[PDB]
Amino acid sequence: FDFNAYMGEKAAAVNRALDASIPADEPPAALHEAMRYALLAGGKRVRPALCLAACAVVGGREAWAMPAAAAVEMVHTMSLVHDDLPCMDDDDLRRGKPTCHVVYGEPIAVLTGDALLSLSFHHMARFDSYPPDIDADKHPARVVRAIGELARCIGSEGLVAGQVVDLEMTVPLERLEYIHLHKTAALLEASVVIGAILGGGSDEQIESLRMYARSIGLLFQVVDDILDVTKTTYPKLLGLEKSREFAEKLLSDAREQLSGFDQETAAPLLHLANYIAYRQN
Amino acid sequence: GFDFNAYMGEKAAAVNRALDASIPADEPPAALHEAMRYALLAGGKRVRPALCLAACAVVGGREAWAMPAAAAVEMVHTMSLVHDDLPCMDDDDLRRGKPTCHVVYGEPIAVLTGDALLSLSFHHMARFDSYPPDIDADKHPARVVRAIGELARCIGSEGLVAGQVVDLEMTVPLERLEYIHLHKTAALLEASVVIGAILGGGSDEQIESLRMYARSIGLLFQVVDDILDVTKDLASDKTTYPKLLGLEKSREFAEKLLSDAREQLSGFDQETAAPLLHLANYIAYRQN
């Protein structure tokens, strides 16, 4: 198993689906260009990869979950487009490239966020988004459950709640944990859970995957804080060494949540967890 | 015969109960919940939920089957207002005599409140427990998927948002004016009746007739608004049907839209279709 090759092939496939989801030749042009600019501006596609890998680990075909992989990346992008607004965060650049509101203006950026959010649901709900070999009997209820999970992870019980609390703005540990679980972990949770649902996973499998996702979700942000402090965060509260220990515990917990799966089949998730833990950027 | 004012009153009451119940009163992210509740429960005549419930009724379903979607469309409607009122967009400080969401809660909270309402509409329509126990367990999932797709479609770059983007781009030709109105007004009306009909177990033929009904009354609404403005910010404000057509041709067009709306419903039980017929009349002959 070659993880870099895996990440490359999944990111390539996901970018293809994303590019195909938005026409570059229809009005209004500014909207479609803003959407494609925001969505096709590269990215490691970690959330779509989690989705496909969770579909695979429960015994599904990855193509069954491709619309959802695309959807969670649309949702992630939307969250970036809105977080970057001058009223919030106020970022002119992302990586080395100017943000959506810089290129297209704030009105177009707000609207681009809304259209991406809408598109995620539209794309996941079209039966023609899925391959012809889906289970015709079971698939509709799976789609409903997945839509419910994505929506639940985005709103006042997930992403937006975290954004709101982070906006209110030293922060106690419980509140920091809240913000990270909602602003970061919720959408990872949705990625793997939706993947497992569409793959036909059992409730038992889905709940193990959910616990895995919550651990790597927190881990993602703890490692983010650690890297940012080396270049309110967990090291500001607990110190760098306790932060590293906590990260270690989260990684170990996540890997342990998969002990019920065939470890060959769970290799992508195991490797994804490693990847999340050991980033250096 | 039929008392439209009473009908609107009972449906608005029922919808308001569902909406109030959709968002917790004291759940931990309080500012957000309060803001959502403020935006969503600040009155309104609830025409879109009523369209949804009436469409479920006319195809032979129970109105309760469509209540979650009714709630959902009002959330989407609210979301659009919340985002439209923003200073970078329409810059409105008041909406129907009440301070807008961003005035009371600030711009960040208004943007996020919009986002949260949009997601709540889908969350709410997808929960199996949102629906009454007597739904068809075999067919209901595929209907919910289809309705969710229609709802999403009416929001994004093929509907509401496309219309707002175009309306912002700033005299306008008739094609662009109708484009703007079809996307900013008709799309969500169409989604309301289409979703209602889907969840009600309506046929493809019934669904498409209701869709055309909604397109016609959506256009009719904006045409009548322009006429009333003559008898009594954006591209659709500056450019009007009477400026393009003259007042008399505008009135003729309104009459044609009304007759079309009424004809789209000719295949339904006219008693069950009463709320829709009377709604079309209300839209055509109102004076404000």
Side-chain angles (χ1 to χ4, degrees):
Chain A
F1 178 79
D2 181 357
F3 186 59
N4 268 244
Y6 179 87
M7 284 311 292
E9 299 165 353
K10 297 313 154 182
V14 165
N15 291 334
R16 253 172 284 127
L18 291 178
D19 180 29
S21 71
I22 306 171
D25 61 289
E26 312 213 82
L31 178 57
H32 290 241
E33 286 299 348
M35 291 173 73
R36 293 172 57 86
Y37 177 75
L39 186 63
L40 301 177
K44 308 182 201 334
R45 310 305 189 197
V46 167
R47 295 161 184 78
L50 281 165
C51 186
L52 300 185
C55 185
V57 83
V58 297
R61 292 299 289 173
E62 281 174 23
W64 294 352
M66 186 57 75
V72 292
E73 190 66 8
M74 293 171 186
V75 168
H76 178 235
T77 302
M78 169 269 302
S79 75
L80 298 181
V81 166
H82 281 185
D83 271 13
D84 287 340
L85 290 177
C87 64
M88 333 231 306
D89 284 13
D90 190 8
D91 295 322
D92 282 345
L93 310 137
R94 185 155 292 275
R95 149 210 165 83
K97 151 211 85 68
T99 57
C100 186
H101 67 90
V102 170
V103 178
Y104 296 94
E106 294 169 62
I108 295 290
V110 179
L111 294 172
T112 295
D114 299 352
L116 285 171
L117 187 42
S118 141
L119 180 62
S120 74
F121 291 108
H122 191 191
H123 189 64
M124 277 199 312
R126 293 182 51 96
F127 282 133
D128 72 324
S129 289
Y130 297 86
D133 72 313
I134 56 174
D135 189 326
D137 189 57
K138 281 165 219 121
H139 195 61
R142 292 174 181 166
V143 172
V144 177
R145 294 159 65 207
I147 286 164
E149 285 282 348
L150 183 62
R152 188 208 83 68
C153 94
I154 298 171
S156 71
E157 302 184 29
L159 185 47
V160 172
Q163 285 170 307
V164 171
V165 171
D166 205 12
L167 274 177
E168 292 172 348
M169 295 140 26
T170 187
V171 171
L173 180 59
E174 181 270 327
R175 222 80 296 236
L176 188 62
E177 291 182 302
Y178 181 96
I179 290 165
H180 290 168
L181 287 173
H182 288 76
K183 219 184 150 158
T184 296
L187 184 50
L188 293 194
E189 175 178 332
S191 304
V192 314
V193 159
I194 282 173
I197 288 169
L198 295 171
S202 72
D203 285 1
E204 188 188 28
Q205 290 174 322
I206 295 162
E207 289 310 311
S208 302
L209 286 164
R210 186 185 311 275
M211 294 170 78
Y212 161 92
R214 190 180 287 108
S215 290
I216 54 161
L218 251 195
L219 174 67
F220 197 98
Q221 205 50 59
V222 171
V223 176
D224 264 11
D225 291 0
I226 291 170
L227 294 184
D228 276 336
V229 163
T230 312
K231 293 179 179 179
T232 299
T233 65
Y234 273 85
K236 190 204 177 199
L237 292 177
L238 302 174
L240 199 57
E241 192 45 58
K242 293 181 181 297
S243 296
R244 281 187 185 119
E245 146 170 39
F246 181 43
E248 275 166 21
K249 189 61 177 182
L250 288 164
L251 176 56
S252 169
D253 290 355
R255 291 178 61 86
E256 272 278 350
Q257 297 298 335
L258 306 180
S259 62
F261 294 97
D262 174 325
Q263 297 295 284
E264 285 286 7
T265 307
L269 294 176
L270 288 166
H271 273 82
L272 275 158
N274 277 14
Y275 168 82
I276 291 169
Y278 301 141
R279 289 132 68 218
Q280 295 295 308
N281 44 65
Chain B
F2 181 81
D3 181 355
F4 187 60
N5 274 350
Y7 178 88
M8 284 313 293
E10 32 202 292
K11 295 311 155 181
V15 161
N16 289 331
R17 250 126 43 201
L19 292 177
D20 180 30
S22 76
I23 308 170
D26 227 37
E27 227 236 287
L32 179 54
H33 288 141
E34 181 188 323
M36 289 173 75
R37 285 176 61 89
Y38 178 80
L40 189 62
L41 300 176
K45 308 313 147 189
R46 309 302 185 201
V47 174
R48 295 161 184 79
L51 280 166
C52 186
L53 300 180
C56 186
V58 301
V59 302
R62 281 215 312 133
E63 280 176 22
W65 298 354
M67 188 58 72
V73 292
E74 188 65 9
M75 294 168 184
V76 167
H77 178 54
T78 303
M79 169 266 302
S80 76
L81 299 182
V82 167
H83 278 182
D84 269 8
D85 288 339
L86 290 176
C88 68
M89 307 258 327
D90 298 350
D91 207 1
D92 302 329
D93 286 346
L94 294 154
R95 181 153 287 273
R96 336 197 205 81
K98 279 206 140 224
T100 53
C101 187
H102 67 91
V103 166
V104 181
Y105 294 92
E107 289 166 56
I109 299 290
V111 174
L112 294 173
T113 297
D115 295 348
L117 285 172
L118 186 41
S119 63
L120 181 62
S121 73
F122 291 103
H123 188 192
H124 189 64
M125 233 189 329
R127 297 227 302 207
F128 285 135
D129 71 324
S130 288
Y131 298 85
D134 67 312
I135 56 173
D136 187 325
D138 285 333
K139 285 175 75 66
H140 194 61
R143 292 173 179 166
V144 172
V145 171
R146 189 176 173 193
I148 283 166
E150 288 281 350
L151 182 63
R153 187 217 85 73
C154 87
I155 297 169
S157 69
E158 300 184 28
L160 185 49
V161 168
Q164 178 73 135
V165 172
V166 173
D167 208 12
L168 277 176
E169 292 172 348
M170 282 146 43
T171 193
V172 168
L174 180 61
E175 105 202 328
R176 185 164 173 104
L177 185 60
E178 285 188 27
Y179 179 98
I180 291 167
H181 289 320
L182 287 174
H183 286 73
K184 284 183 70 182
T185 293
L188 186 50
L189 294 190
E190 295 174 29
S192 304
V193 302
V194 161
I195 287 175
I198 284 167
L199 294 173
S203 74
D204 286 359
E205 297 83 357
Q206 290 175 323
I207 290 163
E208 293 315 313
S209 301
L210 285 164
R211 184 181 240 120
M212 291 303 99
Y213 161 86
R215 185 189 172 281
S216 288
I217 59 157
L219 262 178
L220 176 67
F221 196 92
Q222 300 297 338
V223 172
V224 168
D225 264 14
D226 288 355
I227 292 169
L228 291 180
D229 277 341
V230 167
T231 68
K232 314 218 174 309
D233 325 280
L234 311 159
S236 57
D237 293 322
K238 190 85 184 67
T239 299
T240 67
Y241 284 98
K243 282 175 181 186
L244 291 176
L245 306 177
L247 193 56
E248 316 65 37
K249 292 181 181 297
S250 294
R251 278 185 184 122
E252 280 171 22
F253 183 41
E255 279 161 4
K256 185 190 180 55
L257 288 165
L258 177 57
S259 65
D260 186 78
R262 292 180 59 83
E263 273 284 354
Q264 300 299 332
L265 305 180
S266 64
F268 296 106
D269 176 55
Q270 300 297 287
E271 230 181 9
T272 308
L276 297 177
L277 289 165
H278 279 86
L279 176 60
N281 277 16
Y282 165 86
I283 291 171
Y285 299 134
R286 64 204 178 81
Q287 300 294 307
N288 289 337

